[PDB]
Amino acid sequence: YRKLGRTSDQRKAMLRDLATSLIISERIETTEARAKEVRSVVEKLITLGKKGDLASRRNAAKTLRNVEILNEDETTQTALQKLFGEIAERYTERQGGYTRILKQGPRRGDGAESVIIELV
Amino acid sequence: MIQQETRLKVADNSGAREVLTIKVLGGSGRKTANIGDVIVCTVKNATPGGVVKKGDVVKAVIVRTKSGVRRNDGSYIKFDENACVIIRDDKGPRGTRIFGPVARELREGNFMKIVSLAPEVL
Amino acid sequence: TKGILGRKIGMTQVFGENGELIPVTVVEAKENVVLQKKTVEVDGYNAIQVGFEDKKAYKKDAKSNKYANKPAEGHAKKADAAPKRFIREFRNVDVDAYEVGQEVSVDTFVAGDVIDVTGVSKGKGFQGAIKRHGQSRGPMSHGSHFHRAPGSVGMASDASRVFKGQKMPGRMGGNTVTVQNLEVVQVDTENKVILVKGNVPGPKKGLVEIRTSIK
Amino acid sequence: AVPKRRTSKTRKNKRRTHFKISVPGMTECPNCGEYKLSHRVCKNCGSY
Amino acid sequence: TNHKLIEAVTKSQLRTDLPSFRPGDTLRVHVRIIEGTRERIQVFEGVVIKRRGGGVSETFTVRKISSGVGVERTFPLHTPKIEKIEVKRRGKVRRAKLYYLRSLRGKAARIQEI
RNA sequence: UUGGCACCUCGAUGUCGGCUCAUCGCAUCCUGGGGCUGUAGUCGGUCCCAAGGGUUGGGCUGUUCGCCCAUUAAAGCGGUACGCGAGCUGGGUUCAGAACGUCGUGAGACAGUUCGGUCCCUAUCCGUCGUGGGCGUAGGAAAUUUGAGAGGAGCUGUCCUUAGUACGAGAGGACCGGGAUGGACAUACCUCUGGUGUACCAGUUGUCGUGCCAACGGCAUAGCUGGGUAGCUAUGUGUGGACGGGAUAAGUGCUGAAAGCAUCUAAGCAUGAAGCCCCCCUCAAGAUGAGAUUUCCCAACUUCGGUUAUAAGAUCCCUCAAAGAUGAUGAGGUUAAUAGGUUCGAGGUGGAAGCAUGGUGACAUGUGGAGCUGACGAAUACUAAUCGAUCGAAGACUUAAU
Ligand SMILES: [Mg+2]
Ligand SMILES: [Mg+2]
Ligand SMILES: [Mg+2]
Ligand SMILES: [Mg+2]
Ligand SMILES: [Mg+2]
Ligand SMILES: [Mg+2]
Ligand SMILES: [Mg+2]
Ligand SMILES: [Mg+2]
Ligand SMILES: [Mg+2]
Ligand SMILES: [Mg+2]
Ligand SMILES: [Mg+2]
Ligand SMILES: [Mg+2]
Ligand SMILES: [Mg+2]
Ligand SMILES: [Mg+2]
Ligand SMILES: [Mg+2]
Ligand SMILES: [Mg+2]
Ligand SMILES: [Mg+2]
Ligand SMILES: [Mg+2]
Ligand SMILES: [Mg+2]
Ligand SMILES: [Mg+2]
Ligand SMILES: [Mg+2]
Ligand SMILES: [Mg+2]
């Protein structure tokens, strides 16, 4: 695995903050090497959603943050309920994958290769 | 692994109680020793009376190191302390009443006098 | 005599007779064929060449090495065979055996034979002087500013240069090395493996050349 | 630690013969637009 | 499943007749010694400290106090020089490696049963 | 070495010992081969050939040097700015403080003691260690090779037989040969013994938080503690150097004259060292002298001035690691298992959550070798390695065989 230029405690925190906002917004834009690493983290988290029992509900809460979504029709759900509620429905037949990575050009301030990672 | 200036316990009734190594003899450049090797040492602590007295320079044979020996069948043996028996340079002991267990590997060192005097050989 | 090619698999142990334990390297030596017989009349020295592991046939838009190309196809057709990945030569064998196109099977060795094994080493990258050579390092306290550097590199002004062969840092790396006087302990025909006593140079799934001992 | 002589104009110019830069990949956007970079996504001025 | 060719080769050299045990159990190991002329058998009794490894290269370790001196002894599991192993008493521990017994003495280095 | 001379260096050639790293000589410490002996044997003395390799750990001193303790086959002498401070220390000494003795009316001094006292520099060129690009090698490519030359390696003990024989009054005690096993050193590797193992498992303290219990998270060196996969590793596991051929050194000889003898030499023929050359391992055709074998491919325009499109084959670009500073190398690019995921395993940890039961309670038992699991193995196209672009030959003359 990669180190991403951070310390062990910072890398873990940056990687689960990044995985949460991919559940909220379903496609985000970041660098190349960071998207290669959050690829495997978020798909192990949909596997927990497809099981659906209590013990894996407890295990996914190790990783996700506490974020409220202002859902449509003025409803509100947490990020954990949205994982076991909607994403677990769409991928009940597929056996892996669930994400893709699309490359773009460099940014201006760096030569950093931008990347869109989306949820499929 | 027994270097120079390691303390050992003496495991007979020859009078000595603790000793420390001067040379690991053998060849030039020799560094360590194990069960069945012969070292030269000085007594640092003695029992009143007895044959050897404190400050003598003697020769001795290693029994039961802490990091033990590998055998040909892939078996191991290990002990809790280092021990030692002062010899007369015939490969015969000074005392008469070897204490504790003694490793098998000094059978082929022609130390049969030491093996016979001892308790359990494992 | 008795050359064969194979690749490393791993390392295990085997209990010999009377309970003796011996460490063992397992080498898979599969589908070796004789591919060209060389002659002192045509080439100036007698040898055979052997191809080890077959690969896929010619394709129009190959972009890698697992498909043979047209020079390799015609060379591996003149002996009626499939194209191979590794090709070496053995000039210790007797050339009056080995018709071209034979399969040198794994049981040309019998348990008890002494052999020599050749491969390339692991490879370590850019390494410094106390790792690459066996150099002593400086003191770690008492005010020293000298820990892992090399020492002096020459004299003063007689020889105002550095001699060559001076043991500076650089690439530690993997180069060819042979080990001598090993043994074959057990030959398996169905799985086509050889067990050798000891350890051989190279990483896993490497490439080793086994031939008989010259001494 | 310091240079003993200046460096002439020839020796400076022989040194930077490899100090160059390369042309990029340059595929095309086949649907609609100008050239994009290879294995990238023709977002702007592009439909691929 | 380490590697398919490795278990295929070393399968035949692997014993079958051994009982089951986990660390903390008390074992009697009948080991046989080739003397100068004979094949005399000797028993070594102790407490299993650890088991490690897999396959043919399995290994365990038993610990005994002989003459006030602790003695460790370490065997390959599938060796042919062990004749027989008896499980003398089951133990009740909570570690997989019992290294804390090395620095105990007296009756403090005791293990419950079952 | 102590000195004599005062030729370079005063617009600076900047330091004694120790550390690290070496290289050369031989007037040879050990090992090898011989002669003489006041050499019985075992041991020794002295001289000759010989520089391949090897040539120790500590106590006291700033110390060089030297003494001593224990070992060793041996503990050699010298050169290289009394080898090496733009590679290291800074104990010593030519700095400022202070004190003793002595000298001096005194300020001060000794060269006599003692305590303390700041070691700068981002490597341009040559040079060395490693790695790449360009061109060339009378067509262009892929692969396997020869080996002119070069480098490395080169050590040694103890025990058992021969034999308690030879020798000797006895005490003592062999050569020549034949076996086994070690020390130091060098290389490869992680099955074993062990180390580490910051995205593995478990226990535990304080405080804040997820509305509360219960279960979890953050911070406290990774909070601490006990274990630990892959990989990297030694103190661990394998292997290596005491062989063989040729020419020689000191030396021993055969035949043999000059000189009717004798004479190892003048002509001729042998033998003879771990040293020389081969034998062993590694690199090696930029070996411009550019080598060899096998296989693949072959165009028109044309003012052949060059243009165009190209073959075999490569590359750009992307997924990677058995490889790696970068680059190169190697595995792969949908006619696909390269990576990720999913499923199943190995190994590691050691009995999850929830529920039930017993107990005043701390807690215990069952469901259940449970659950979790990074790097390891196999299967599976679910995701991504798309479409594309670039480079790339068209076999010169002379002569002789045919
Ligand atoms: Mg922290
Ligand atoms: Mg050191
Ligand atoms: Mg320029
Ligand atoms: Mg002078
Ligand atoms: Mg002058
Ligand atoms: Mg003058
Ligand atoms: Mg000047
Ligand atoms: Mg001489
Ligand atoms: Mg002291
Ligand atoms: Mg000097
Ligand atoms: Mg200097
Ligand atoms: Mg003063
Ligand atoms: Mg006065
Ligand atoms: Mg002070
Ligand atoms: Mg002081
Ligand atoms: Mg001073
Ligand atoms: Mg392993
Ligand atoms: Mg609260
Ligand atoms: Mg609570
Ligand atoms: Mg906080
Ligand atoms: Mg820990
Ligand atoms: Mg792999």
PDB file of N, CA, C and O in Angstrom, chain E residues 65 100-101 103-112, unseen atoms left out:
ATOM      1  N   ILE E  65      11.004 -28.527  34.449  1.00  0.00           N
ATOM      2  CA  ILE E  65      11.960 -28.141  35.479  1.00  0.00           C
ATOM      3  C   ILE E  65      12.601 -29.411  36.008  1.00  0.00           C
ATOM      4  O   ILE E  65      11.921 -30.244  36.613  1.00  0.00           O
ATOM      5  N   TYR E 100       5.350 -16.060  29.273  1.00  0.00           N
ATOM      6  CA  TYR E 100       5.423 -15.497  30.609  1.00  0.00           C
ATOM      7  C   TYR E 100       5.810 -16.515  31.658  1.00  0.00           C
ATOM      8  O   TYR E 100       6.091 -16.123  32.787  1.00  0.00           O
ATOM      9  N   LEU E 101       5.818 -17.798  31.334  1.00  0.00           N
ATOM     10  CA  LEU E 101       6.231 -18.797  32.299  1.00  0.00           C
ATOM     11  C   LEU E 101       7.730 -18.869  32.464  1.00  0.00           C
ATOM     12  O   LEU E 101       8.198 -19.533  33.388  1.00  0.00           O
ATOM     13  N   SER E 103       9.744 -16.484  33.293  1.00  0.00           N
ATOM     14  CA  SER E 103      10.170 -15.616  34.378  1.00  0.00           C
ATOM     15  C   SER E 103       9.324 -15.824  35.626  1.00  0.00           C
ATOM     16  O   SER E 103       9.009 -14.879  36.344  1.00  0.00           O
ATOM     17  N   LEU E 104       8.939 -17.061  35.888  1.00  0.00           N
ATOM     18  CA  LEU E 104       8.252 -17.415  37.115  1.00  0.00           C
ATOM     19  C   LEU E 104       9.003 -18.545  37.787  1.00  0.00           C
ATOM     20  O   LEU E 104       9.861 -19.188  37.179  1.00  0.00           O
ATOM     21  N   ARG E 105       8.679 -18.779  39.052  1.00  0.00           N
ATOM     22  CA  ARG E 105       9.313 -19.827  39.829  1.00  0.00           C
ATOM     23  C   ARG E 105       8.319 -20.338  40.859  1.00  0.00           C
ATOM     24  O   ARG E 105       7.277 -19.726  41.104  1.00  0.00           O
ATOM     25  N   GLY E 106       8.653 -21.480  41.458  1.00  0.00           N
ATOM     26  CA  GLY E 106       7.863 -22.030  42.540  1.00  0.00           C
ATOM     27  C   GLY E 106       6.503 -22.524  42.079  1.00  0.00           C
ATOM     28  O   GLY E 106       6.337 -23.054  40.979  1.00  0.00           O
ATOM     29  N   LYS E 107       5.511 -22.338  42.945  1.00  0.00           N
ATOM     30  CA  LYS E 107       4.133 -22.677  42.623  1.00  0.00           C
ATOM     31  C   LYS E 107       3.417 -21.566  41.876  1.00  0.00           C
ATOM     32  O   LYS E 107       2.248 -21.735  41.520  1.00  0.00           O
ATOM     33  N   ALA E 108       4.085 -20.437  41.637  1.00  0.00           N
ATOM     34  CA  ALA E 108       3.484 -19.368  40.853  1.00  0.00           C
ATOM     35  C   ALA E 108       3.350 -19.742  39.385  1.00  0.00           C
ATOM     36  O   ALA E 108       2.489 -19.190  38.694  1.00  0.00           O
ATOM     37  N   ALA E 109       4.171 -20.670  38.900  1.00  0.00           N
ATOM     38  CA  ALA E 109       4.115 -21.117  37.510  1.00  0.00           C
ATOM     39  C   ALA E 109       3.254 -22.372  37.380  1.00  0.00           C
ATOM     40  O   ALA E 109       3.698 -23.427  36.937  1.00  0.00           O
ATOM     41  N   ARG E 110       1.994 -22.239  37.775  1.00  0.00           N
ATOM     42  CA  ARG E 110       1.036 -23.330  37.711  1.00  0.00           C
ATOM     43  C   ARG E 110      -0.072 -22.996  36.722  1.00  0.00           C
ATOM     44  O   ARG E 110      -0.392 -21.828  36.493  1.00  0.00           O
ATOM     45  N   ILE E 111      -0.647 -24.039  36.128  1.00  0.00           N
ATOM     46  CA  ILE E 111      -1.707 -23.915  35.134  1.00  0.00           C
ATOM     47  C   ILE E 111      -2.876 -24.775  35.588  1.00  0.00           C
ATOM     48  O   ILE E 111      -2.678 -25.923  35.999  1.00  0.00           O
ATOM     49  N   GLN E 112      -4.082 -24.214  35.535  1.00  0.00           N
ATOM     50  CA  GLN E 112      -5.288 -24.943  35.886  1.00  0.00           C
ATOM     51  C   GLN E 112      -5.541 -26.067  34.886  1.00  0.00           C
TER      52      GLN E 112
END
